[PDB]
Amino acid sequence: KIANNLKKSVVDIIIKSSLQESTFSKFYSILSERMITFHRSWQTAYNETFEQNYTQDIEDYETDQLRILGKFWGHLISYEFLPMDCLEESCPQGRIFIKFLFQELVNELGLDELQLRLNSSKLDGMFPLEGDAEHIRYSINFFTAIGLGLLTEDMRSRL
Amino acid sequence: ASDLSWSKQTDTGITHFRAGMTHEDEKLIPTIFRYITTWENEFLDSQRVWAEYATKRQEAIQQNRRLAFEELEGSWDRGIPRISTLFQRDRHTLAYDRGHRIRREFKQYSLERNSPFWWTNSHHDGKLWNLNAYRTDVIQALGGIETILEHTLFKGTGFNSWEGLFWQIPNRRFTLWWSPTINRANVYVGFLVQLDLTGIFLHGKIPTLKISLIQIFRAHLWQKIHESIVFDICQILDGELDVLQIESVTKETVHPRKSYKMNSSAADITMESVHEWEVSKPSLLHETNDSFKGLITNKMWFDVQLRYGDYDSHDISRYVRAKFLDYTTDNVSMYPSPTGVMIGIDLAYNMYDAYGNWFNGLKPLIQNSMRTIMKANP
Amino acid sequence: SYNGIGLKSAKGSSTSGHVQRSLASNNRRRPQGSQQQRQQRQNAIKKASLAVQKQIETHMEKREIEVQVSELRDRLEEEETLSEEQIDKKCEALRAKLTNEWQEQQRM
Amino acid sequence: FNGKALNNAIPGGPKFEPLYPFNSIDRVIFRVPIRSEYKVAFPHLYNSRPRSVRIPWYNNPVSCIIQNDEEYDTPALFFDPSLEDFAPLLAEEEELILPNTKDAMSLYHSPFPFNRTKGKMVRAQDVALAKKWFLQHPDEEYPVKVKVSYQKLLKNYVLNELHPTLPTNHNKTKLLKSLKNTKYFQQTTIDWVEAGLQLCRQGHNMLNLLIHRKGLTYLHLDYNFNLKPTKTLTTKERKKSRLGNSFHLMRELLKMMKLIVDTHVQFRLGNVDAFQLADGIHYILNHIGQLTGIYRYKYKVMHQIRACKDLKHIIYYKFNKNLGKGPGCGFWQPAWRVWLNFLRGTIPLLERYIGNLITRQFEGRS
Amino acid sequence: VLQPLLPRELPKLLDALNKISKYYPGVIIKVEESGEHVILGNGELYMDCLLYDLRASYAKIEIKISDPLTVFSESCSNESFASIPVSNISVAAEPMDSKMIQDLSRPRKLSKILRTEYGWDSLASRNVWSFYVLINDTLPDEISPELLSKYKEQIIQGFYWAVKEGPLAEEPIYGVQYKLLSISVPSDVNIDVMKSQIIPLMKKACYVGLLTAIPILLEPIYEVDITVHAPLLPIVEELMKKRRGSRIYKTIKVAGTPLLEVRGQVPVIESAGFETDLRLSTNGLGMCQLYFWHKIWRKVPGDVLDKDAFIPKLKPAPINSLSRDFVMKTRRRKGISTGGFMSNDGPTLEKYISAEL
RNA sequence: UAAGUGAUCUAGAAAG
RNA sequence: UUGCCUUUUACCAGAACCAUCCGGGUGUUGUCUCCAUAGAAACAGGUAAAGCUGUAUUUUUU
Ligand SMILES: O=P(O)(O)O[C@H]1[C@H](OP(=O)(O)O)[C@@H](OP(=O)(O)O)[C@H](OP(=O)(O)O)[C@@H](OP(=O)(O)O)[C@H]1OP(=O)(O)O
Ligand SMILES: [Mg+2]
16 A cells, blocks of 8 residues: 555565566566556656666666666566667666667567567667767667667668 | 356456465565576576576687686576586586486385485586575564564573574474463463463463473472572561661561462561651652652561563563552452562563562662572572 | 355365455456557557449439339329329339430430 | 355355355356355346255335434425315324324334334343344444454354254253252242352362262362362372363353352452443453363363354444443443353253263263 | 256256246247257346246256346448348348337338328338338339239248348347348249248348448347435446446436435346345445336447457456457357357358458 | 455364 | 364364254143122113214105
């Protein structure tokens, strides 16, 4: 019966617990799904927690913990968020978290399917079309690190 | 526990949760299943870490170095087999142990104590789990170490701290440890009986516990304790006779029964005064504001009231007060004065307290006395 | 037991046999409404998409003529036409006038 | 009964041990989620494969409008419709309502106890002041334990209803009647306390006589019927002194009796107030388990104990609605009823048991 | 739907059923193709009573029982666009007028006049009718010239078969006209072999018409009667909301008492344990009733002939998915569909004109 | 057109 | 038949059978008690009080 006040806090706690473990668990993912489904407030909480993570908490984690977190988020992303993604400068560990997330997504959905999905969404930070002077190079470069297509296409479009 | 008649036909989403292993005062005991890495995770993880190892091995080759465990730390505890198996004290012996799984399987057919973990071997694969996490989490979850010991007879031993503990005979110890919890005041039907020579009200028989306690108070020990305390009190009074204007400190010799008899009480010490005393209204020891009414006494009495508490009756002050104005205001075992003092010692918790009337400037002496005795009565 | 869902009975089980409804049940109660956008997207993706007609038309046409015939029958049977010749004659007229008009239609 | 017979426990009421040990999902259409409540309502229809199932009632809507106070014959709770020298009958009866008919109407609508203005007596025992609380529904949001208690009570009630124990009629020579017939009994009007005390004395003398007769004088009966050995027992002696479930049960019943009689004595001996007495008696009845190990010897007494507990739970939370917590409730009736019925049950058992025992004491064993 | 628990005791049930029929007049007792017997009760309590009588005092046999299904009835929404014939007969159809429906549920010239009074229908359509149960109009062009159209008694019986066992799931036809448009009778033929052809062929034609008429399934609706204390009025409304398709039409306040004897309408599907549930919720202050004398059928929401259609297996199906679910499920019940996965659809050539072109 | 009402077993004595 | 268990009593709680017991009803006899304690009143009426009926102009009787 937790009130709207601490829902965010609860979610944070859950996340931290997830992090503590050796690896990402279906368990936590399912729990997240259930809570999300339940009430709009919890959806909001999960969102804001996500924001908190990529904003500030993200860069404190280790590659194992961070990876796990990414996986968890990917699982959630594949269904119960919109792919809203506030994402050149910030590549300490956040970018590798992103890598993990993308990997998770691809593994779950599929490559072409994923592309289609993202195409439907806005994707400003991930997939900029307006060139911004050798800035797409960066995103393009990063996505070449993992098995992704359409970067080449984007560059062609941009010249 | 989903709809049993439907569930037989198709898989349901789990709808209704039954209560499994329940309890009154439900402290959420964590399971074990949460603290074991579920297999799929273990296997994806394994694939990752082994891939990493492979890559680093190539790096080592290229660089022409020994790929030490300083570089592979973190992944040490992950994967199948566990990465630890690469650098244990004798791989170059275990290299020649082919057909190991099969041999472990067929221990089944050739032994009495068939091993429960036939399915793996630690030499070959390493610790495939680690339940220190489970231990720690569980203790955190039962209100911590701090709180568990309130259930136990830790308070009875009287250590400086529980942290200073570290450096049908074996289960007797176990029983004695949870004496207070197991012999509990609040209880369903258990009929009350007391062990012989003692005030150890067992709420329904337990054999082992009874055996323990009886051995604990062998040689009439309870009675001895009672008498000892009485003697001490007498000595104290003798010492501080002229300070509190006392004519005579006499011991009213009761039966040996009194020590542990609980339905009644004759007074242990009777206190003949020089002048009339003007004792305060009855109160506890630490109750500071003692009210001096116009009532006077030419004679007080001191009674001890040994008790052996439980996890439920572990306050003494209330009990001693009850005892005081039970035996006074009861027409069996009358004291020479209805005005007097009563001490009671919780032997199970080392929680002294006393209630009753107070001669002026007496209370501090009694408080100090109790403090001393508790610190070190023989 | 309760609604096909409690434990058979608390004896045996070695427990309370207390039976909560889950609160993921609300998620399983409304996953179509919650994840309507999953199917919605899919639906959207495929959301864009003579002889019989001719026969129908023919029926209507012949039917119309037959309505004319019926009307003739009405007029005759009601208002002074006790004979059969009147009926038959009327029918003939309908055929001639009707199929004339419809011949015109055909021509156009 | 229906709930029992189908294991379709109505959640407010009882849940039993089960009476026993096409229709595919592809076929049917789960439009109405078919509830258990229906499965007992129309048992033969909604619940397929019924066995030993009764048919319940079905009923008309009750508009018994009760009056608050200080008036008569008034539409209050409801709305009104759209639109040769002789007097009528019962003339010279100006007042339509008498001063009692306001109440008489109420009385008329009442249930079986007050409904009527004549009856046969029943034994205090035979009146069930408590049955009417738990038979009707639990009021509002009691603690889980009390709800459980309610359910338990209903389970008992249903069982009692279900196995009718038709009393056999031919045996119309009662025990007391039989005794009355002889010379060796006389009768007197004695105060109930006197009867009690005398019976404690009598019982004590009986049990001591029995024990001494057996030979084992080393078992000292305390006057409070709390038996214990005097000396440390030789193994032989110990073996001899393991008195059975008859003697111990007898002792326990006397212990029970000795308690309540003693409390009465205390009350009447100027010690305690009548409220204190009532509370005392109640305490005794609800804690027979905790005051006398009756359960030890005859464990089926747990049912009785459990029943008492349930009653306490029920009573207290109807006794402590606006009133806070504490020990000062009396009201010992229904528990007392329980104990009476337990004694009724056991009187045969103890006549047999102790019968055989004393026979063995006298005649050798077969 | 009854089945005896043991096939060893089947004859007894049959005998028992007969007895029940004799004793309970308001029970249509269709023996379905599978062996699974259908019993149509008036409502719930009556049905229960019937079952009790059967299971206790006549059969004395344990009996598997289906959850309370409802006799649906196939129909149309619009007139049939096509007129595809039948062979080794092209029957069009259209929705009967809603006044005329009611008129039907309770001398050619006279009848014609009556028809023109009901719905102002043409004298051509008035002459050629031979209705039952709905209406068999012999309204092609050649039929007045022809006496092949004559001896339509056999044809009418075939039509009766159609009405009995509809195209969708052997569910009876309701509220539907039947305009004939052609007949495929060759010149030389025996009346036995021709008539025999036309009977099933008539059924086929009817089904085709229904298919082309945008067929809709019709559930029935109980007229409701709920006397409740005024204070417990919104509870009833809430309950109705909880139920599907339930409408509340007038809350006539019963004078001189707190009872608001409110009429309503619960669909016969949604109605099950309605009385009981109401009683429970209302704390036994709501002696409710259900009944069906109006014969007020209505379209189950959602459209028949959909592939994906619905979501749930356990949960009650959505509003717009409902009709399809009812049809497929009922087909399964009646043993028409093949296994789990199947579909109700047209049995005609030309690839269904490439699915409406 | 978007939440949380509710089902809560035991229960101690003898002798071995 | 289950459960606790495991060895029995004692038990868990369901079943089917059966019994025991706490009580109950009437009816008839008899006793015990407390009150009692008359071997004859109507008819003719009167007095007062209780139970029914009564207060012609076409089918009953004007
Ligand atoms: O539920 P039980 O185990 O039978 O115990 C009850 C219960 O105490 P717990 O709730 O602590 O168990 C009652 O407490 P409430 O539920 O009513 O708060 C209390 O009743 P009172 O509050 O009226 O005292 C009563 O105590 P008592 O017997 O003194 O009435 C006590 O029974 P026990 O004392 O036998 O445990
Ligand atoms: Mg043996």
